[PDB]
Enzyme design. Structure first.
Site, PDB file in Angstrom:
ATOM      1  CG  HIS A  87      -2.109  -0.996   0.893  1.00  0.00           C
ATOM      2  ND1 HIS A  87      -2.192  -2.210   1.529  1.00  0.00           N
ATOM      3  CD2 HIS A  87      -3.177  -0.921   0.065  1.00  0.00           C
ATOM      4  CE1 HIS A  87      -3.274  -2.842   1.122  1.00  0.00           C
ATOM      5  NE2 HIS A  87      -3.910  -2.071   0.231  1.00  0.00           N
TER       6      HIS A  87
ATOM      7  CG  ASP B  58      -7.713  -0.850  -4.734  1.00  0.00           C
ATOM      8  OD1 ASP B  58      -6.495  -0.487  -4.752  1.00  0.00           O
ATOM      9  OD2 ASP B  58      -8.391  -0.989  -3.700  1.00  0.00           O
TER      10      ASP B  58
ATOM     11  CG  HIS C  40      -6.759   4.247  -4.080  1.00  0.00           C
ATOM     12  ND1 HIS C  40      -5.599   4.240  -4.794  1.00  0.00           N
ATOM     13  CD2 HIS C  40      -6.920   3.002  -3.594  1.00  0.00           C
ATOM     14  CE1 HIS C  40      -5.074   3.034  -4.755  1.00  0.00           C
ATOM     15  NE2 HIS C  40      -5.871   2.251  -4.031  1.00  0.00           N
TER      16      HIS C  40
ATOM     17  CD  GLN D 216      -3.753 -14.556  -4.417  1.00  0.00           C
ATOM     18  OE1 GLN D 216      -3.619 -13.915  -5.452  1.00  0.00           O
ATOM     19  NE2 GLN D 216      -4.301 -14.033  -3.332  1.00  0.00           N
TER      20      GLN D 216
HETATM   21  C1  LIG Z   1      -7.370  -9.213  -1.497  1.00  0.00           C
HETATM   22  C2  LIG Z   1      -6.277  -9.452  -2.450  1.00  0.00           C
HETATM   23  N1  LIG Z   1      -5.898  -8.464  -3.274  1.00  0.00           N
HETATM   24  C3  LIG Z   1      -4.876  -8.737  -4.152  1.00  0.00           C
HETATM   25  C4  LIG Z   1      -4.395  -7.737  -5.068  1.00  0.00           C
HETATM   26  C5  LIG Z   1      -3.333  -8.039  -5.907  1.00  0.00           C
HETATM   27  C6  LIG Z   1      -2.697  -9.336  -5.904  1.00  0.00           C
HETATM   28 CL1  LIG Z   1      -1.368  -9.740  -6.956  1.00  0.00          CL
HETATM   29  C7  LIG Z   1      -3.177 -10.308  -5.039  1.00  0.00           C
HETATM   30  C8  LIG Z   1      -4.262 -10.045  -4.138  1.00  0.00           C
HETATM   31  N2  LIG Z   1      -4.682 -11.068  -3.272  1.00  0.00           N
HETATM   32  C9  LIG Z   1      -5.679 -10.794  -2.447  1.00  0.00           C
HETATM   33  C10 LIG Z   1      -6.197 -11.767  -1.480  1.00  0.00           C
HETATM   34 MG   LIG Z   2      -7.389   1.028   0.105  1.00  0.00          MG
HETATM   35 ZN   LIG Z   3      -5.512   0.434  -3.062  1.00  0.00          ZN
END
Ligand SMILES: Cc1nc2ccc(Cl)cc2nc1C
Ligand SMILES: [Mg+2]
Ligand SMILES: [Zn+2]
Length: 313
Positions: A68, A217, A106, A269
């Site tokens: 982040h 996002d 964001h 995943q």
């Molecule tokens: C919530 C979540 N968001 C992601 C965003 C990007 C990537 Cl590569 C993996 C993610 N895995 C999860 C579980």
């Molecule tokens: Mg956020």
């Molecule tokens: Zn974000």
């Protein structure tokens, strides 16, 4: 007025594609963002002096967390850029202006912890904002930076245009709260199927912009496999840190955040692509046909995670 940003040839071409990676050279990311603002919006949208001072203040207020971070901000803005460039005529002048800024802002001042962890820690922000805790904070920080002397990139808008753009940015940033995505996509799904979806209905545009925000996002799942796989380490590094902090509050974390259950990640995943990512890019592809490459890339990555489980990597 006549000062363009120009990128090297490979970047100039690849930046137009959904799966573009902004690269490991941090010092090029501001220019990449201005480049995108100029081609998406115009060279006149923002005073360059003011835009540059806003960009650098936003950068300073993203923290040194594994995922982040400033790179996530610019990555999410690039996905918004690609959606807008492939849907030229569907968005207003104010919307193009607002959404690139919403994307860059964001996750402002993210600490790498979920709304859940803030609530269980009893963090002050959880008392100030009962729902979408971090997202109300991100909007707060965005307004704060806009009101620094010399940082008001919107000062040339009329009074009512200014109120509309800040309202686009607030809804856009709130919508990045994944807890709100599930209901938003269900509603957009019903509306598209029963044929009541109407992009002149402001409450319908709001919903579609929200889904666009979720799509941008999550856009790390729409990159080439080696980018998606290496980004997944960064996302899981934060999850496991949060899991450690849960254990410190005497709470067993969910398996996703437990670093002792790394073996369960490939299956986690799969769940995430099937429950969140694929549905998100499907409904987006239904509403905005030219965003289909995001869905194609997401399916390719689902297939790569199936191969990880089957021991083929
Ligand atoms: C919530 C979540 N968001 C992601 C965003 C990007 C990537 Cl590569 C993996 C993610 N895995 C999860 C579980
Ligand atoms: Mg956020
Ligand atoms: Zn974000």
């Amino acid at each position: 007025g006549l000062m363009q940003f120009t990128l090297p040839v490979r970047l100039c071409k690849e930046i137009e594609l959904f799966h573009f990676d902004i690269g490991p050279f941090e010092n090029m990311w501001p220019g990449i963002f201005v480049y995108m603002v100029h081609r998406s919006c115009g060279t006149s949208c923002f005073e360059l002096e003011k835009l540059c001072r806003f960009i650098m203040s936003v950068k300073k207020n993203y923290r040194r967390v594994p995922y982040h971070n400033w790179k996530h901000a610019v990555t999410v803005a690039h996905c918004m850029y690609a959606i807008l460039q492939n849907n030229h005529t569907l968005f207003t002048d104010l919307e193009r202006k607002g959404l690139l800024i919403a994307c860059l802002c964001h996750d402002l001042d993210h600490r790498g912890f979920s709304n859940s962890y803030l609530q269980k820690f009893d963090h002050p922000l959880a008392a100030l904002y009962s729902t979408s805790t971090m997202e109300q904070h991100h909007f707060s920080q965005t307004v704060s930076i806009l009101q620094l002397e010399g940082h008001n990139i919107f000062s040339t808008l009329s009074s009512s245009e200014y109120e509309q753009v800040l309202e686009i940015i607030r809804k856009a940033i709130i919508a990045t709260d994944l807890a709100l995505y599930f209901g938003n996509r269900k509603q957009l799904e019903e509306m598209y199927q029963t044929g009541s979806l109407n992009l002149n209905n402001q409450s319908h545009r709001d919903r579609v912009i929200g889904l666009m925000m979720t799509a941008c996002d999550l856009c790390s799942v729409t990159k080439l496999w080696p980018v998606t796989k290496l980004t997944a380490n960064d996302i899981y590094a934060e999850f496991w840190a949060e899991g450690d902090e849960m254990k410190k509050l005497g709470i067993q974390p969910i398996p996703m955040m437990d670093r002792d259950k790394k073996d369960e990640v490939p299956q986690g995943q799969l769940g995430f692509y099937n429950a969140v990512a694929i549905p998100c890019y499907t409904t987006l592809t239904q509403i905005l046909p030219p965003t289909e490459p995001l869905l194609k890339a997401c399916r390719d990555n689902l297939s790569q995670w199936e191969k990880v489980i089957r021991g083929e990597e």
